Design a protein around this ligand. Structure first.
Ligand code: CNC
Ligand SMILES: CCCCCCCCOCCOCCOCCOCCO
Ligand SMILES: CCCCCCCCOCCOCCOCCOCCO
Ligand SMILES: CCCCCCCCOCCOCCOCCOCCO
Ligand SMILES: CCCCCCCCOCCOCCOCCOCCO
Ligand SMILES: CCCCCCCCOCCOCCOCCOCCO
Ligand SMILES: CCCCCCCCOCCOCCOCCOCCO
Ligand SMILES: [Ca+2]
Ligand SMILES: [Ca+2]
Ligand SMILES: [Ca+2]
Length: 584
């Protein structure tokens, strides 16, 4: 196991987390030769992603079949900051260079974190420890190119620093669109450019008390497609800027853990064509500022812990009505162990300045009935806050309540003859779904979803061969009308194969994207169409040409499989990348 700290906010061992958690490390990501967050995520259990194309294009994540806004994305413990009016975050913009570790725990977790923890939680962590300085970059399949410098160091004792800058660029391909340009097209590759900057300070006043400060930021330009009058502007292009800063102290004692954290984030997300735009306009800007403050405690008691915090949010976006919004929550957590029984739980009330008070809880009990074998049940209750669009839009309704989930899940987990496996069943009923009525050009909370999913995983070695495999089946329907929701695969299958030989470290990663259902905007009324669903393979190698130098190479979409995760957006297709790192 591996500590991981994103279940109850403090360190703890995964074994000791009844819910399915998955962790991705740097080694991992470097292996994977991943070039985006999207890449990494798509691999793990329960994740369905979709893309209005290649790199840089919006994207969307469906954890166990919930809506794309029904996931909580945390960066370093802290809600992302998706600006605009749809929960949807789209980690297509979030520089992968920043990523040192992802920690991902599927299932509800609003009783710790609040809103969005409905499917599960994706905590992306920017923080390393792993001193030295590093150069690198790469080249490839669409004049893609990347360069990058890293270091962390000490400035005398109890202090260390960390800087990173990183530049990627690609020209891309046209992604056609097809029901989003109207009269004409693009016949234009729609590229992406991001440039990024990170700094850290890290400091112990002692071997218990510590602090940080961080600051980071990026500056992306990506090009997209739109709709079109001959006219009459486009909106070709998007330009996002985004900075964050944090501060905390921690104290980590033998029994009692504490943290006080702080952070402030501000983006500014221009869309525009492209000629006299800006600035025009003809030119939409969405800006946001989120502030955050949180203080938490835990301590050790039994083979258990108890913990609690308070946790405060302020988001002022800019335009007369939707602008400044505030949340505050207070929760409790508990772990314990008794015999071969674990019990783990959490609860929270939130007070939200639009919709007032709402609360939320979860439980799990496990039973290790034979050594190595273990049976877990869980129950849990989560929610999602209304968005401005829904609230204060043109069909806004500022009285909306949140959207409510209930989830049950059942799992067996075992070691058997060398294989670490798990399998797991869940029902999630969602409700008070926010659903506009043509009806009256207002939204209301009215709609219901059911989800029934199964998650099976395994890992093992045979040779010098390593196997990491999962299967996922998600049956996600509209409860009222009993049709399949959209853009979701009933079925996924993901294998990875790792091994080492001569000095070539090899990986081959397979996935099957099962078939799915969506909308063809080609023509109103708009109809749904069934996408067929498909098999990908990528091939990756690395070599330590020295001792400081690794040199890698990756063929992605190894055969050449055409397909979409969104009807009308062309996906990538076969790409090469050729890449290098020096250390010292
Ligand atoms: C719906 C829609 C669509 N939209 Co909007 C349009 N036009 N639009 C919206 C509206 C949805 C409101 C609602 N859905 O009830 C609406 C009015 C909010 C709008 C919003 C915006 N629109 C935007 C854009 C970019 C586009 N939109 C598309 C997603 C363009 C879509 C093109 C497409 N995908 O076919 C789209 C035409 C169809 C998506 C769909 O229905 N998904 C079905 C659902 C199951 O999938 P999903 O993943 O849950 O979809 C969600 C999101 O995609 C999201 N969303 C909507 N547009 C965006 C844009 C951004 C950047 C983000 C992060 C999310 C979104 O809302 C969804 C559901 O609540 C887009 C691919 C069309 C186009 N050719 O560019 C495109 C993005 C290009 C790119 N790759 O970055 C805006 C920047 C428009 C503008 N300049 O104001 C903007 C941002 C919203 C925000 N909060 O930041
Ligand atoms: C000191 C508070 C610890 C529990 C806080 C969260 C409890 C939320 O519901 C828990 C009760 O539901 C089932 C009871 O059985 C186990 C309770 O939690 C044990 C947590 O370690
Ligand atoms: C710290 C532990 C938190 C325990 C919370 C779980 C129990 C929640 O209580 C019941 C859930 O629904 C609440 C209302 O119950 C019946 C309502 O009857 C009157 C309706 O207006
Ligand atoms: C130390 C903080 C304790 C936080 C626990 C709050 C958890 C949420 O409450 C239980 C879940 O929701 C049940 C409450 O819902 C009923 C609301 O009732 C309030 C007064 O009737
Ligand atoms: C749903 C989970 C079903 C789990 C059943 C596991 C039952 C027993 O499995 C392993 C028990 O050990 C027998 C296997 O081999 C014994 C190896 O022991 C080495 C020397 O005795
Ligand atoms: C304890 C793990 C459950 C394992 C799933 C495979 C065996 C299923 O047996 C009967 C099939 O169930 C039909 C429903 O399948 C999806 C339901 O999933 C969870 C909904 O409660
Ligand atoms: C899956 C029921 C058998 C007991 C668990 C076996 C451990 C799973 O390891 C293999 C997982 O990889 C794919 C599993 O596919 C099996 C379940 O799919 C059945 C869907 O109801
Ligand atoms: Ca374009
Ligand atoms: Ca209310
Ligand atoms: Ca044991």
């Amino acid at each position: 196991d591996t500590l991981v700290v994103t279940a109850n906010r403090f360190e703890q061992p995964r074994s000791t987390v009844l819910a399915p958690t998955t962790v991705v490390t740097r080694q991992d990501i470097d292996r994977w030769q991943s070039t985006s967050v999207n890449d990494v995520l798509r691999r793990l259990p329960g994740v369905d992603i979709t893309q209005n194309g290649g790199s840089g294009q919006l994207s969307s994540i469906f954890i166990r079949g919930t809506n794309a806004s029904h996931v909580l994305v945390l960066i370093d413990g802290v809600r992302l900051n998706l600006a605009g009016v749809s929960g949807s975050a789209d980690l297509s913009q979030f520089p992968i260079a920043l990523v040192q570790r992802v920690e991902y725990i599927r299932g509800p977790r609003s009783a710790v974190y609040g809103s969005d923890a409905i499917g599960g939680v994706v905590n992306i962590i920017t923080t390393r420890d792993e001193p030295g300085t590093e150069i690198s970059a790469g080249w490839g399949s669409n004049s893609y190119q990347n360069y990058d410098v890293s270091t962390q160091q000490q400035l005398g004792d109890k202090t260390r620093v960390t800087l990173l800058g990183d530049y990627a660029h690609t020209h891309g391909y046209d992604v056609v669109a097809y029901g989003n340009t109207g009269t004409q097209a693009q016949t234009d590759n729609d590229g992406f450019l991001s440039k990024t900057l990170y700094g850290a300070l890290e400091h112990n006043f002692t071997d218990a008390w510590s602090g940080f400060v961080r600051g980071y930021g990026y500056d992306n330009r990506t090009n997209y497609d739109a709709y079109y009058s001959p006219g009459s502007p486009l909106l070709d292009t998007r330009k996002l800027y985004s900075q964050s800063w944090d501060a905390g102290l921690r104290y980590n004692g033998e029994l009692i853990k504490s943290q006080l954290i702080t952070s402030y984030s501000h983006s500014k997300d221009y869309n525009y064509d492209p000629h006299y735009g800006r600035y025009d306009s003809s030119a939409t800007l969405d800006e946001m500022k989120q502030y955050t403050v949180q203080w938490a405690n835990n301590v050790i008691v039994g083979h258990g812990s108890i913990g609690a915090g308070v946790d405060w949010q302020k988001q002022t976006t800019t335009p007369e009505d939707g602008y400044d919004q505030r949340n505050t929550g207070i929760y409790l957590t508990g772990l314990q162990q008794v015999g071969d029984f674990t019990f783990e739980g959490a609860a929270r009330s939130d007070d939200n300045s639009q919709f007032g008070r709402h609360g939320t809880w979860q439980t799990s009990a496990g039973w290790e009935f034979i050594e190595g074998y273990r049976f877990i049940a869980s129950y849990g209750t989560s929610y999602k806050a209304p968005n401005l669009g829904q609230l204060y839009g043109f069909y806004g309704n500022p009285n909306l309540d949140p959207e409510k989930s209930k989830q049950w899940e059942g799992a067996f987990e075992g070691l058997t003859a060398g294989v670490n496996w798990r399998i797991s069943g869940y029902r999630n009923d969602v409700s008070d779904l926010i659903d506009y009525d043509d009806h009256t050009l207002k939204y209301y909370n009215e709609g219901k979803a059911r989800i029934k999913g199964v998650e099976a995983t395994a890992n093992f070695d045979t040779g010098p061969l390593t196997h990491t495999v999962s299967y996922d089946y998600v049956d996600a329907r509209n409860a009222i009308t009993d049709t399949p929701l959209l853009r979701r695969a009933k079925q996924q299958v993901k294998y990875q194969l790792d091994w080492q030989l001569y000095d070539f470290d090899w990986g081959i990663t397979y996935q099957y994207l099962g078939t799915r259902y969506d909308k063809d905007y080609s023509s109103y009324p708009y109809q749904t169409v069934k996408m067929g669903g498909v098999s990908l393979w990528d091939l990756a190698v690395a070599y330590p040409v020295t001792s400081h130098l690794t040199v890698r190479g990756k063929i992605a979409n190894l055969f050449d499989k055409d397909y979409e995760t969104v009807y009308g957006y062309q996906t990538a297709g076969r790409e090469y990348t050729l890449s290098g790192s020096y250390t010292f």
